[PDB]
Design a protein around this ligand. Structure first.
Ligand SMILES: Nc1nc2c(ncn2[C@@H]2O[C@H](COP(=O)(O)OP(=O)(O)O)[C@@H](O)[C@H]2O)c(=O)[nH]1
Length: 320
RNA sequence: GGUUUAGAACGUCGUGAGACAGUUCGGUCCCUAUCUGCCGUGGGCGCUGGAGAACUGAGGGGGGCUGCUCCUAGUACGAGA
């Protein structure tokens, strides 16, 4: 029946300011509002193939409905940022849009392939202008044009990409002394933040010991889910660099339809648990038409995400 | 071609001949350049013995126009556009 298990489902939005990189990263994704899916097994053929539902958005203030009418259909948000500008007024807009629907955000600081590109500065820019509290998942290696890869704060390796074929044949590297000290600094500032998921993690670290990356990734995913933090990654979609690890972070922190509480509905008016519903293949059918389109071919075409239920080709439905 | 000749007509003016910054159709435009000027082109003598050539260069003239496309570069600027 179901081709991919619900747990292997990511509903991600790519929203940012204008020309921040959205469509470029989406093309790099298709290689490695416009809704489109993909099957990204993993970076090392790990993570048996996930089905990532990507809703590429506009970033213009003119088309703000075209992103707000997808935000409350999405389950996660991949907020893109440029590395020379970072937070723009347009970035503040879609940010407030996502805060209105309480989306668990990660961030992707694109355009590290430009002059004046920074990563620390843009992280702090996010922390000061918007209000978010970001945990840097990556850290750039190569300032503006020397940008070759990043260091992780979980694997402690360098994913320096191979620039012979576009961005697919990356290598794992020895995280050399180019930056191998700030790496430690922010790795520790990441552990200290993932400790912020349970008292039993305070007692875990406060023993003077660094816990394991498995239960650090689980803890940080819990934090993204409760919207407690935001995980920022670092890439360059135009120089075919950094995109696959942002996809990894999407797999590892963004929510599946079951990694959240149920969707609360209404039976006939506001009741106690009127029609709270959970994403399941056995529920009564329920969806939400988040977008109407005008088919060039037909003139009518309705987008919808099924929250609870399973509909069929021909099934009657109720415009509740 | 127009404008202002001699023909003819219209409207109007006048009794009329005729007339009208009124109109209309028709209606002959000559000169072999002496001088200056200019464009070329030579003859004489001169430049101090005659000749053949190669130059220097005072000075004079000619020439000086610009579009579009691509690159720098979707770079600077610009929240964006
Ligand atoms: N230098 C550089 N240019 C990029 C990068 N990513 C995208 N671009 C350029 O941005 C231009 C338009 O961006 P676009 O994909 O439309 O993003 P949008 O503003 O969200 O629509 C393209 O011609 C790309 O070359 C990058 O990482 N570095």
């Amino acid at each position: 029946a179901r081709t991919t298990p619900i747990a292997r489902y990511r509903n991600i939005g790519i929203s940012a300011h204008i020309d921040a990189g959205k469509t470029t990263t989406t093309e790099r994704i298709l290689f490695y509002s416009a809704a489109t899916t993909a099957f990204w097994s993993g970076m090392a053929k790990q993570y048996e193939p996930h089905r990532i539902n990507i809703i590429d958005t506009p970033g213009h203030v003119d088309f703000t409905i075209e992103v707000e009418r997808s935000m409350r259909v999405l389950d996660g948000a991949v907020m893109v940022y440029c590395a020379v500008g970072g937070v723009q007024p347009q970035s503040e807009t879609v940010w407030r849009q996502a805060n209105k629907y309480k989306v668990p955000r990660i961030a992707f600081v694109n355009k590290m392939d430009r002059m004046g590109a920074n990563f620390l500065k843009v992280v702090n820019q996010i922390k000061t202008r918007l209000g978010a509290n970001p945990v840097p998942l990556q850290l750039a290696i190569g300032a503006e044009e020397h940008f070759t890869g990043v260091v992780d704060l979980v694997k402690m390796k360098a994913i320096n990409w191979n620039d012979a074929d576009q961005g697919v044949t990356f290598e794992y590297e020895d995280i050399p002394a180019d930056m191998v000290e700030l790496a430690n600094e922010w790795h520790q500032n990441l552990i200290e933040s993932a400790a912020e998921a349970s008292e039993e993690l305070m007692e875990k670290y406060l023993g003077g010991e660094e816990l394991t990356e498995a239960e650090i990734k689980g803890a940080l995913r819990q934090r993204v889910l409760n919207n407690e933090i935001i995980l920022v990654t670092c890439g360059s979609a135009f120089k075919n660099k950094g995109v696959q690890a942002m996809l990894d972070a999407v797999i590892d922190y963004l929510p599946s339809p079951v990694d959240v509480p149920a969707i609360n509905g209404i039976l006939d008016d506001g009741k106690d648990t009127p029609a709270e519903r959970h994403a399941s293949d056995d529920e009564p059918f329920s969806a939400l038409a988040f977008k109407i389109a005008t088919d060039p071919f037909v003139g009518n075409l309705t987008f919808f995400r099924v929250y609870s239920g399973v509909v069929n080709s021909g099934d009657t439905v109720l415009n509740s």
